[PDB]
Amino acid sequence: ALLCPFPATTPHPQAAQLANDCLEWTRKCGLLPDESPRTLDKVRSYSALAAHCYPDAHFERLRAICDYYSWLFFFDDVCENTSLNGAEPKVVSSLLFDVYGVLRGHAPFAQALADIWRRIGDGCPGFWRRRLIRHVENYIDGCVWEAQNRQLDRVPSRAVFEGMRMHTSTMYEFWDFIEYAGDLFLPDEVVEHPLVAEVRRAGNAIASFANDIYSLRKETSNRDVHNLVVVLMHEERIELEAAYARAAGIHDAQVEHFLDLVKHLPTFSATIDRNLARYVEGIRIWIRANHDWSIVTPRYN
Amino acid sequence: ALLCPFPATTPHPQAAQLANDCLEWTRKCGLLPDESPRTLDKVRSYSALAAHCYPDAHFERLRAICDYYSWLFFFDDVCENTSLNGAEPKVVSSLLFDVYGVLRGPTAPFAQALADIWRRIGDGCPGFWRRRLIRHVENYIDGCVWEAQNRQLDRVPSRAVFEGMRMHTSTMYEFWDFIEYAGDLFLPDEVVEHPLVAEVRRAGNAIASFANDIYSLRKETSNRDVHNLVVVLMHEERIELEAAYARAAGIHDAQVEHFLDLVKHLPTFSATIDRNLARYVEGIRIWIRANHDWSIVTPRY
Ligand SMILES: [Mg+2]
Ligand SMILES: [Mg+2]
Ligand SMILES: [Mg+2]
Ligand SMILES: [Mg+2]
Ligand SMILES: [Mg+2]
Ligand SMILES: [Mg+2]
């Protein structure tokens, strides 16, 4: 039902082993809420997503990303539930900063994140580490804002939600990981160039709004409001199906916008231009992978 | 210092009478905190800004816009002081929604004065434009409640989150809306929401807002406020003030160059719409230069 003009890509050749190793790591780190087939299948699903998003990565880099996918799904759920079940924003803030603090210098999640970070950190330069950390700090701010909305029993206005969703989605982190997974790093002058930044935002919006459309049933069952469809219903005073259609239109316009923008990328140098082209291709791969996965993942379905 | 590539324009020829009339309206409505000459000169200065920002508007439209400039300065200051002096976000939210609720109809000096402005503006605009303005007001309210959140939590927001929220707290999207009202030429939703046009609107918002942060830093820090690009840079990048001014100027200048490029590739819609879009973009240019010339000399900063 959504515009997805990007072709599918063969997943990483070691996808099966990746899922097995990742599941064992999540268990050993104590991150599984239970050992039901539903829970284990979800972890296997996240690992399938990772293997389709970064199909050309060296195995051990993909393994670290894969661990982060599962770690983040679980910890974001913990932080969401903390807020949904009535915690003050200060408590949500303390939880996030306490766990993510290991990126600069605590229950199951701090130690497990430190383990991921030790492996990723060894394969990346400082300027990229600061870039990822900033995107994490952006996400934390976005999550504390969500917690404030819940404390105030508020549905955010659409323009503000769409902006903040770019942070809560963590997709900027997963663009960062395109560089890590390919071992091809872009200088700040490139990713911060306003045209490239708008490409990154558009791809974020495509993936995040697709997630919203497909994750709507789960989030509404959870009494959560941070979903483009719910936000559209409240702002425009429309019913669910009409809001789905508006959300799809917004998604599709971002797709068209992305495709236009990437035809007019700024130029820097033969080497940087080639790395930027691989980075943008990585975003295209991620978008299609996310699209196909969202339709079938048991997390939403 | 800051890049301003947009030539200046003569102000509205009735600028002097406009300032006199606006001051008398501001006094009659009871919005003046006191009758000192520096308070009165602030109103005169904001009316001078209005007369430079919409120099071709019919006088009665410019007059309503002018009353809103001064109304907004005073009321935004009341909301800032409410939060700076310890109010919980819910109190800030209630103050804002109670006063701005009159944009939807009759429901305090500020609410009555806003209703008077809105009665006049509404008589000269279609419904879709009124909803657009009201939505941008609601975005700004969300932005202000978020600032109150940060102050309650003693948080300096990370830069990317601040820059996105600053687009709403600046109210510049409302003043782009007023370009349509001032010229009595209204763009359909499909045009202003087109992602390329939206990015033009955002870039212009950033140019004006980040210039305002740079020039309005000395007074915002004497107010114990952190919602300023320069301060946000110091905390995020761990740099000293002059370095942060330099970074902020570079970010401003990159948005300017981005804007200059984007407006050469506007989408086409129809004969009349394209003509009106060209006037709208030119209005943003006029506004940006008018704001630049005024910010350097205004008593407010
Ligand atoms: Mg979430
Ligand atoms: Mg979630
Ligand atoms: Mg979701
Ligand atoms: Mg303000
Ligand atoms: Mg202010
Ligand atoms: Mg300011």
Author numbering:
A (entry chain B): 32 to 136, 143 to 338
B (entry chain A): 32 to 138, 144 to 337
What does the paper say about this structure?
The crystal structure of ScCubS in complex with the trinuclear Mg2+ cluster and PPi was determined at 1.80 Å resolution. ScCubS crystallizes as a homodimer and exhibits the class I TS structural features, comprising a bundle of 17 α-helices and a central hydrophobic cavity, showing structural similarity to other solved bacterial sesquiterpene synthases. Docking of FPP into the ScCubS-Mg32+-PPi complex (PPi removed) and sequence alignment with previously characterized TSs suggested several residues that could provide the highly tuned control observed in ScCubS, namely, F104, S206, F211, A244, and N327. The polar side chain of N327 points toward C11 of FPP, the position at which the first cyclic intermediate contains a positive charge. It also binds a water molecule close to this position. F104 is on the opposite side of the active site to N327, with its phenyl ring well placed to stabilize C7 of cation C by cation−π interactions. 1,10-di-epi-cubenol, however, is delivered by hydroxylation of cation D at C6, suggesting a role for F211 in promoting the conversion of cation D to cation E, and subsequently to 10-epi-cubebol. F211 is positioned “above” the substrate according to the scheme shown in Figure 1, and C7 is sandwiched between F211 and F104. The “PPi sensor” R202 is linked to S206 via T205, and the carbonyl of S206 is well placed to interact with C3 of FPP. S206 and its neighbor T205 occupy the so-called “kink region” of the G-helix of TSs,25,32 a short, flexible region that moves toward the substrate in response to PPi being sensed by R202.
